[PDB]
Amino acid sequence: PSVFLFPPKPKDTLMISRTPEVTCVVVDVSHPEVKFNWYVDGVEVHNAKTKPREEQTYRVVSVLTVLHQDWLNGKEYKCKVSNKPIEKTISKAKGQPREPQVYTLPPSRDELTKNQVSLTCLVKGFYPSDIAVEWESNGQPENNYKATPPVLDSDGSFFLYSKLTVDKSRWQQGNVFSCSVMHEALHNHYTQKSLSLS
Amino acid sequence: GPSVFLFPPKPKDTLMISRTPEVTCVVVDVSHEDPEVKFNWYVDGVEVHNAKTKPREEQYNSTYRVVSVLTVLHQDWLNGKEYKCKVSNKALPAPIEKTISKAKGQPREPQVYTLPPSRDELTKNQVSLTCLVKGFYPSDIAVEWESNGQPENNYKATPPVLDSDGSFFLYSKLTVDKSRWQQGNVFSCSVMHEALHNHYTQKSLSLS
Ligand SMILES: *[C@@H]1O[C@H](CO)[C@@H](O)[C@H](O)[C@H]1NC(C)=O
């Protein structure tokens, strides 16, 4: 009945050493088997790997490795599911890519009454939405941060915010935190900004 | 065969007295052959009759999407009333029932923090004022911006995101001419949520 076709992880398409994949997820299957057909700009490929079956009905996932440049150039990946057929497609959005602007914002004066404070990373003006944002300090990832999903801005670019939560004492001490952003329009697909008490 | 989805009211509708919150019952994959759907609606088990039936809209794969809309009293949504949709159709062997209500769980008041633009952005012709709303439950909220009495043209909120303590947060970005910011003009983030006193709080932001 139901088919979902996810794109590759942003970080996996921008680092050459990682391996980006398109995942075609079928759910709500009978007790049973399913046929996958895969196409790249209309042309069938047979290198996709089907994962083991996953219960509750049954969930079946097929994973196709994509070439980094095929995705960034924006080839279409089409998944066809046949069973006792539904087609789904995905692709990097068309349009002039745009460099993200990364701004780190310290916590509000008001938040300093709380045991934990929020450090905020604003990433805006970027296209397409595919992006990866991470927090770290002293060359180590932080335990507790989350980002919003990308949101479409009025100019047709995307933005998002990443909220890092830390113990106040750690911020008041003078520790430096850094928001790392990875995106295709960035030189080296990578930029970092820092933020510390001052 | 046909499937049934029941949607809650848009959050801004449940929080403003001038707006019309409604629960929406959506039946998809209704056939061309038997396109007739009977809706029954109940609130805490009592049948109600004021629901509105929308014209069916055909999916060009020769099926219909069929929708019924029940307007809800702001206070009943707020107090935890269950809304029930029962759907009947020739294709179905038994009618299908779905129940929806406001999210259960101890309500929590939003903390509201306005943040100025980063130094770096003052480079630009427009700058971003930011309103961080965190700590809140349930997720239904409304965040708006204004100054000097008027609402602001150019802003957008993220959706609410589930934080790690089981509360929600979200951010609202307001964009303004750098000039307006430099000049000391005062901007206010407003926030409407059930757990706030009078369901409303307001926080300001200027050159500080
Ligand atoms: C027809 O199209 C709609 C719209 O995408 C889809 O939700 C529905 O499942 C389809 N029904 C079919 C193919 O019978």
Numbering used by the authors:
A (entry chain A): 238 to 268, 271 to 295, 299 to 326, 331 to 444
B (entry chain B): 237 to 444
Article passage:
The ability of an antibody to recruit the killing machinery of the cellular immune system is dependent on the interaction between the antibody Fc domain and Fc receptors found on cells such as macrophages and natural killer cells. The binding of Fc to Fcγ receptors (FcγR) bridge the adaptive and innate immune systems and is a primary focus of therapeutic monoclonal antibody (mAb) research. The strength of Fc:FcγR interaction is also highly dependent on the presence and composition of the dynamic N-linked glycans attached to Asn297 of both of the Cγ2 domains of the IgG Fc homodimer. Notably, secreted endoglycosidases are able to cleave the core GlcNAcβ1 → 4GlcNAc linkage of the Fc glycan, release IgG from cellular FcγRs and abrogate Fc-mediated effector function.
To elucidate the molecular basis of IgG deactivation by endoglycosidases, we deglycosylated IgG1 Fc to a single GlcNAc moeity and determined its structure by X-ray crystallographic analysis to a resolution of 2.5 Å. Comparison of this FcGlcNAc with known glycosylated IgG Fc structures reveals that endoglycosidase cleavage induces an inward movement of the Cγ2 domains coupled with a rotation around the central axis. This structural transformation displaces equivalent Cα atoms by up to 8 Å. Similarly, displacement of the C'E loop in our FcGlcNAc structure provides a plausible explanation for the altered hydrogen/deuterium exchange kinetics reported in this region following deglycosylation. We also note that mutations able to restore functionality to aglycosylated antibodies include residues in the C'E loop. The change in conformation seen in our FcGlcNAc structure also offers a structural basis for natural immune evasion by a common human pathogen. EndoS (endoglycosidase S), from Streptomyces pyogenes, deglycosylates human IgG and decreases FcγR binding of antibacterial antibodies, an observation confirmed here for FcγRIIIa.
